């Protein structure tokens, strides 16, 4: 058993670190301001402490939200794992703050005090001891269903049970063959997911979805995403992502008739949709996209390329960020969202010739993982899009950036769920293998180094999941815009770490394509790149918001 004082000691130390973190943010905010406003040039100059402060903030908030969750219903497993991560987070955040304080020339006496604190040393010796980590690992093997048991009502809990059963029965048997043969998602699996309601979780009931009309709770979308992603990230969990992004764009900027026509159809996968933002020369820099839209009678003709457009072959509609104004001096103000319609194709390339002479061609890009929808290089040549298919119609012209960003918040929240499911798959596989594999006379699980790795893996998984559900509740209340990107950043890198470590526990087995953890590892690597690359999120969403809020508070 852990000391009875551990939770209080952890909370006190995290609050001390939060004070130091907030002091560094204000110090940095002053070094980035010129004339009462953040300065783009100084922000670029100060990227290194900005990046480190974004990561320190993610780890701090993961530890706090996890610790705040401990109540009378928390499982015995989770109580131990939450404290493990919180003690680790104390040292992680302290380490970053020492580097940040040095770079910003701040006094570090208080940081030295925290490191020499006798309570921190006692926590290392009790919560992070080799026997305590080993005991937590044995407890996980005894009751794996208690790992990450976040608070849900019975309804959400039964939705989880149904989708875990479906993912295990129907998705998991197909996951390896889809990856190794780079197959498009079978129609049978698409039909099943459609009838489970997987395309309408983000869409209000009044537009033919299943989300209640008066509210915006993402927790249902998150729980289904997690269950499906555990079985297959790309072939099941990621089918939710495109409707999430495009429903949010249509709700942000569509007219009533566009919301009525499109959202009802997207909810039943007819048509399936794909997101066409990224271009060969622009991915992080959405404001700079150049795919050209030129007005003709009754609509637009599009010319240029898109790339990495996932599911573009099978999709019947594309959400295309289009530069509709030739004046490049407008930046993002020259962008509009256009709905390009196309036939549905099952292959790795397609060549669609329109009536008026336009064309759209596509060729899939082979990837190390994330396989099953394909991601395509697209070429638009005088491709026609009618006026009606401009999201927002006439008033949507020049506002495509705002509606894209609205979609991205939902996408990143959902991507935290995707990372969570991949982590749970990797964790359970490592726990199972450690129990079954014998080395030097005993099950691998019985060795203290194995216990420590498994408990640290689980602690990170669990802290990521409690943070994910916390941000979901923030979004349900109209808050947490920045925090969706923070938990995306935290969970997606955590998926890399957890999958790497699970693979290692497997030994050579972890490297074989016939062993699922090899696939979880190459799949997880994409999570920190797409949907907002880690650095872009840390600098231009998380770091920017932290500094803006410090400026205002001290104005």
Ligand X SMILES: Cc1cc2nc3c(=O)[nH]c(=O)nc-3n(C[C@H](O)[C@H](O)[C@H](O)COP(=O)(O)OP(=O)(O)OC[C@H]3O[C@@H](n4cnc5c(N)ncnc54)[C@H](O)[C@@H]3O)c2cc1C
Ligand Y SMILES: CC(C)(COP(=O)(O)OP(=O)(O)OC[C@H]1O[C@@H](n2cnc3c(N)ncnc32)[C@H](O)[C@@H]1OP(=O)(O)O)[C@@H](O)C(=O)NCCC(=O)NCCS
* Among 305, 318, 333, CA closest to 397: 333
Q: Give binding residues for FAD as ranges.
A: 47, 275, 277-278, 284, 310, 437, 504, 508, 531, 535-536, 540
Asked if 290 interacts with ligand Y (CB under 6 A), we say no
Catalytic residues, by residue number, are 531
Shortest gap between Cβ of 294 and ligand Y (angstroms)? 8
Q: Is 103 helix (H, G, I), strand (E, B) or coil?
A: helix
Q: Which does 367 bind (CB under 5 to 8 A by kind): ligand Y, ligand X, ligand ZKK, none?
A: ligand X
Asked if 307 interacts with ligand Y (CB under 6 A), we say no
Scan residues 27-66 and list those touching ligand ZKK (CB under 6 A): none
Give the separation between CA 270 and CA 265, rounded to whole angstroms. Answer: 5
Which residues are within 8 A (CB) of 340 and not within 5 positions of it... i.e. 6 or more apart?
276, 302, 317, 318, 320, 360, 380, 383, 385, 389
Shortest gap between Cβ of 307 and ligand Y (angstroms)? 24
Instruction: List Cα–Cα distances, 422 to 140, 223, 493, in angstroms.
Output: 18, 13, 12
Give the separation between CA 181 and CA 509, rounded to whole angstroms. Answer: 20
Q: DSSP labels for 285-314?
A: -GGG---EEEEETTEEEEEEEEEEEETTTT
Which residues are within 8 A (CB) of 294 and not within 5 positions of it... i.e. 6 or more apart?
300, 301, 302, 303
For residue 408, how far is the Cα from the chain centroid?
10
Shortest gap between Cβ of 216 and ligand ZKK (angstroms)? 14
Give the separation between CA 435 and CA 462, rounded to whole angstroms. Answer: 21
Q: Give binding residues as ranges.
A: 47, 275, 277-278, 284, 310, 437, 504, 508, 531, 535-536, 540
- By Cβ distance, which residue is nearest to ligand ZKK? 405
Q: Is 444 helix (H, G, I), strand (E, B) or coil?
A: helix
Q: Is 1 helix (H, G, I), strand (E, B) or coil?
A: coil
Give the footprint of ligand X on this chain (CB under 6 A). Answer: 275-278, 283-284, 308-310, 367, 370, 375, 437, 439-440, 444, 447, 449-450, 504-505, 507-508, 511, 526, 529-531, 533-536, 539
Nearer to ligand Y, 324 or 450 (CB): 324
Judge if the upstream peptide bond of residue 178 is cis by omega within 30 degrees of 0.
no
Cβ–Cβ under 8 Å, residues 362 and 378: yes
Q: Which does 309 bind (CB under 5 to 8 A by kind): a second copy, ligand X, ligand ZKK, none?
A: ligand X
Scan residues 528-547 and list those touching ligand ZKK (CB under 6 A): 530-532, 536, 540-541
Give the separation between CA 447 and CA 428, rounded to whole angstroms. Answer: 18
Q: Which does 508 bind (CB under 5 to 8 A by kind): ligand X, ligand ZKK, ligand Y, none?
A: ligand X
Shortest gap between Cβ of 295 and ligand Y (angstroms)? 5
Q: What is the 8-class DSSP label of residue 168?
A: I
Shortest gap between Cβ of 77 and ligand ZKK (angstroms)? 31
Asked if 324 interacts with ligand Y (CB under 6 A), we say yes
Asked if 295 interacts with ligand Y (CB under 6 A), we say yes
Nearer to ligand X, 306 or 465 (CB): 306
* Residue that has been written with the tokens 């049978």 in this structure: 188
Sites of contact with ligand Y (CB under 6 A): 295, 324-325, 397
Sites of contact with ligand ZKK (CB under 6 A): 238, 241, 245, 275, 277-278, 284-287, 310, 332, 401-402, 405-406, 408-409, 411, 481, 530-532, 536, 540-541
């Amino acid at each position: 058993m852990l000391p009875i004082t551990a939770a209080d000691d952890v909370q006190g130390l995290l609050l001390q670190l939060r004070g130091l973190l907030e002091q560094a943010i204000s110090a940095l905010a002053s070094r980035c301001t010129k004339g009462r406003q953040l300065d783009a040039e100084l922000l670029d100059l100060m990227q290194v402490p900005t990046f480190e402060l974004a990561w320190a903030s993610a780890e701090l908030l993961a530890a706090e939200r996890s610790l705040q969750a401990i109540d009378a219903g928390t499982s015995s497993v989770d109580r131990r794992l939450i404290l493990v991560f919180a003690v680790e987070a104390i040292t992680l955040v302290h380490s970053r703050l020492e580097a940040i304080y040095a770079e910003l020339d701040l006094a570090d006496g208080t940081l030295h005090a925290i490191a020499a604190d006798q309570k921190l040393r006692a926590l290392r010796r009790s919560v992070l001891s080799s026997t305590a980590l080993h005991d937590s690992a044995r407890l996980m093997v005894e009751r794996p269903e208690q790992i990450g048991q976040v608070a849900m009502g019975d309804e959400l809990s039964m939705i989880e049970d149904q989708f875990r059963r479906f993912a295990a029965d129907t998705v998991a048997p197909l996951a390896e063959h889809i990856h190794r043969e780079d197959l498009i998602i079978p129609d049978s699996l698409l039909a099943a997911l459609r009838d489970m309601g997987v395309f309408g979780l983000s869409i209000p009931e009044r537009y033919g979805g299943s989300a209640p009309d008066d509210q915006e709770d993402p927790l249902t979308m998150i729980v289904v995403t997690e269950a499906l992603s555990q079985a297959s990230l790309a072939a099941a969990g990621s089918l939710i992502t495109r409707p999430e992004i495009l429903s949010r764009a249509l709700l942000s900027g569509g007219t009533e008739s566009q919301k009525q026509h499109w959202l009802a159809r997207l909810a039943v996968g007819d048509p399936l949709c794909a997101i066409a933002i990224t271009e060969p020369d622009y991915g992080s820099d959405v404001a700079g996209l150049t795919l050209r839209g030129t007005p003709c009678e009754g609509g637009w003709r599009l010319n240029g390329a898109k790339t990495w457009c996932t599911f573009a072959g099978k999709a019947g509609v594309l959400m295309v960020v289009t530069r509709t104004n030739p004046d490049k001096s407008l930046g993002h103000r020259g962008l509009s969202l256009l709905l390009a319609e196309k036939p549905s194709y099952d292959g790795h390339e397609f060549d669609f010739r329109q009536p008026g002479g336009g064309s759209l061609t596509g060729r899939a890009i082979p990837t190390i993982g994330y396989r099953g929808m394909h991601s395509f290089d697209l070429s638009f040549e005088d491709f026609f899009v009618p006026d009606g298919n401009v999201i927002g119609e006439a008033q949507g012209l020049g506002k495509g950036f705002y509606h894209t960003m609205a979609g991205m918040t939902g996408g990143r929240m959902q991507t935290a769920g995707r990372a969570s499911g991949v982590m749970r798959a990797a964790l359970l596989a490592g726990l199972r293998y450690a129990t079954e594999r014998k080395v030097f006379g005993s099950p691998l699980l019985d060795y203290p180094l194995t216990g420590a790795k498994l408990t640290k893996m689980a602690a990170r998984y669990v802290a990521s999941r409690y943070l994910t559900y916390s941000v979901g509740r923030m979004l349900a209340q109209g808050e947490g815009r920045m925090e969706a990107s923070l938990v995306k950043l935290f969970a997606c890198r955590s998926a890399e770490l957890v999958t790497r470590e699970s693979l290692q526990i497997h030994g050579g087995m972890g490297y074989a394509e016939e062993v699922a953890v090899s696939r979880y590892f190459v799949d997880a690597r994409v999570l920190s790149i797409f949907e907002g690359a880690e650095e872009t999120l840390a600098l231009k969403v998380i770091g920017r918001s932290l500094l803006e809020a410090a400026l205002k508070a001290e104005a």
